[PDB]
Design a protein around this ligand. Structure first.
Ligand SMILES: [Mg+2]
Ligand SMILES: [Mg+2]
Ligand SMILES: [Mg+2]
Ligand SMILES: [Mg+2]
Ligand SMILES: [Mg+2]
Ligand SMILES: [Mg+2]
Ligand SMILES: [Mg+2]
Ligand SMILES: [Mg+2]
Ligand SMILES: [Mg+2]
Ligand SMILES: [Mg+2]
Lengths: 129, 55, 56, 106, 88
RNA sequence: CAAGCUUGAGUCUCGUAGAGGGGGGUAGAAUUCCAGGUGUAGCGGUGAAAUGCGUAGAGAUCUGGAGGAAUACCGGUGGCGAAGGCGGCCCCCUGGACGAAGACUGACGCUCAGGUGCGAAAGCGUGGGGAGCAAACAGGAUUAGAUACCCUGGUAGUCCACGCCGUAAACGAUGUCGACUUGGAGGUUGUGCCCUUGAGGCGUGGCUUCCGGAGCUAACGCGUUAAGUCGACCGCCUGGGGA
């Protein structure tokens, strides 16, 4: 079943990028929007849009640099089957710092760098590079 | 539309020996070749059509 | 196959007409097939093999 | 109520019982709140192949709308009756009242 | 399966109206009626293993619906089982 | 924890295709047998034979009858089923799938150790049934031998009822459910639309076959029915032999 909506969003991005698709649409959620924000603010996607009221649909405009997709790798870390939580000092850095780790902290969803600056820890949602 | 009573139309889809003619020869649709075969068998039982070219 | 010899038609033509009626009805083919027992697995294997051959 | 197309063929030596059979069959259907839509006495007809050393037999078509109880006793009365050499009751999705190709080919 | 007239009768008896067809009480009663009717079929046709699989699906579906109603409204469940004469 | 929400999952209405299951009828071909007509010296079988059958009249042919088992053609990389498997025709009882349009319930869902049920053939028990086929067994051959392959026979068994057994290369050698990712040609089964239609034109679902792109793979190959990209849960593997 649809037990992991977050891994689905990442897979929709991953497959869309591989299929040279201009955009990817999926059923929306606050958490999907919070991740979409971090992806846009770090230049992994162009822009995101939430259409509808009763059945919200999140659309993400994919980014393509030159002959290639911007998102090289996008993997789910913490998942329903095994939750990954890290302390401020244990926070992981993707590509030795050249990539981002989406962390869910007490003060919201942000990058590994952001949480490190804010002295926070949390659930490691995904790795993006 | 197909009926065992219409031995007029039925006689076109059976051979000289009484055998049902395959869809590959008659060019009929799959759904209706099945409907035909049932009608030919229904008409055969009721002695409206023969089984073999002996009787 | 029931063949009726026509008026002023030679015997050679009537026999050739009969041989073609038997060829059409598959007389010798149905006898070859029924001579010996064939397992359901074997007739299913033959049907699959012939369907593959009917692709050129 | 279900729809049925009954076809029974009577021995030619008993072709006189046929009107009496029709009267009785119709009475059992109408008696059980059932309806009769088509009835066609085809009379003596030539058989495609012989059945019980016979060539020719009396045919009767019937398109009925009746409960499964009277259609069951109709099926048994055909087995029990020696006059009926063959019968076939076929369930139909809807009632039919149109000249069958037997009425039309004459 | 269960007749148009028989199904409609159950919908009225257990539903909020004639159109409240999805109500758990309606659903459980429609399954109860068919499970009970089929008892007669499987008494004569004990070797009908294929149809029995479909009956067991009705039984397992009823159980899942009954357990759902038990946690959502204990009173509505207590009434429903007493109304159709079932333990659990 | 509380209240919801309708997209997941169900319920309802009308239909559609199907060897899906259980029961009861019934039909025509053929084999064997019995009974009779005609007929006369062979038939049958094989690589060749012989065993075997036939002057108590076979085989061949025609007619009548008994009985069992299986359903030619249709028939199709056709269809249905969870798998095993399911095929003449008719009815009765019944399970599933799919489509169209709305309405209803409101996360009721997915998976599943243990548990439970089903489960080809052979085999087992009791009573039936027994035409054909045929383990065993007998005879005739082949061969250096021939406990075989071939031939003539033939018992269990194969068939039915009720129990049992619980296994197969039980295979797609591919666990189930869900989401996402270029295409081409067919087959099958729904349905919306358009024409003067004794057919086609344009869509939109379910299933299925061949080919193939990316990707994947040790390769072979797989390729929207994945063996691709991901997630949930389960089963299982850890060198060969021993086992
Ligand atoms: Mg049904
Ligand atoms: Mg016979
Ligand atoms: Mg509501
Ligand atoms: Mg036994
Ligand atoms: Mg032998
Ligand atoms: Mg024994
Ligand atoms: Mg095993
Ligand atoms: Mg390739
Ligand atoms: Mg391929
Ligand atoms: Mg070892």
């Amino acid at each position: 079943s649809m037990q992991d909506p977050i891994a689905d969003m990442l897979t929709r991005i991953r497959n869309g990028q591989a299929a040279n698709k201009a955009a990817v649409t999926m059923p929306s959620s606050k958490l999907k929007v919070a991740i979409a924000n971090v992806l846009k603010e770090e230049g992994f996607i162009e822009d995101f849009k939430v259409e509808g009221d009763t059945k919200p649909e999140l659309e993400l405009t994919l980014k393509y640099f030159q002959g290639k997709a911007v998102v090289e790798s996008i993997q789910r870390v913490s998942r329903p089957g095994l939750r990954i939580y890290k302390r401020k000092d244990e926070l992981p850095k993707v590509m030795a710092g050249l990539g981002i780790a989406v962390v869910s902290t007490s003060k919201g969803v942000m990058t590994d760098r952001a949480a490190r600056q804010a002295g926070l820890g949390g659930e490691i949602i995904c790795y993006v590079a | 539309e197909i009926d065992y009573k219409d031995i007029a139309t039925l006689k076109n889809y059976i051979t000289e020996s009484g055998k049902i003619v395959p869809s590959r020869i008659t060019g009929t649709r799959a759904k209706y070749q099945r409907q035909l075969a049932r009608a030919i068998k229904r008409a055969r039982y009721l002695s409206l059509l023969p089984y073999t070219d002996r009787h | 196959p029931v063949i009726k010899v026509r008026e002023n038609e030679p015997f050679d033509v009537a026999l050739r007409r009969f041989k073609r009626s038997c060829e059409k009805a598959g007389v010798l083919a149905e006898v070859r097939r029924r001579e010996f027992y064939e397992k359901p697995t074997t007739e299913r294997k033959r049907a699959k093999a012939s369907a593959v051959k009917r692709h050129a | 109520m279900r729809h049925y197309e009954i076809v029974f063929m009577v021995h030619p030596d008993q072709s006189e019982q046929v009107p009496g059979m029709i009267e009785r069959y119709t009475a059992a259907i109408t008696g059980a709140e059932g309806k009769i839509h088509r009835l066609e006495d085809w009379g003596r007809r030539q058989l495609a192949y012989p059945i019980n050393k016979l060539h020719k037999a009396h045919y009767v078509l019937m398109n009925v709308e009746a409960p499964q109880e009277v259609i069951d006793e109709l099926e048994t009365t055909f087995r029990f009756n020696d006059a009926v050499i063959r019968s076939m009751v076929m369930r139909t999705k809807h009632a039919v009242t149109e000249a069958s190709p037997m009425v039309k080919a004459k | 399966s269960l007749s148009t007239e028989a199904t409609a009768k159950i919908v009225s008896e257990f539903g909020r109206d004639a159109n409240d067809t999805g109500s758990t009480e309606v659903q459980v009663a429609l399954l109860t009626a068919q499970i009970n009717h089929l008892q007669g079929h499987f008494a004569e046709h004990k070797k009908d293993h294929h149809s029995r699989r479909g009956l067991l699906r009705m039984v397992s579906q009823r159980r899942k619906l009954l357990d759902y109603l038990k946690r959502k409204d204990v009173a509505r469940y207590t009434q429903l089982i007493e109304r159709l004469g079932l333990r659990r």
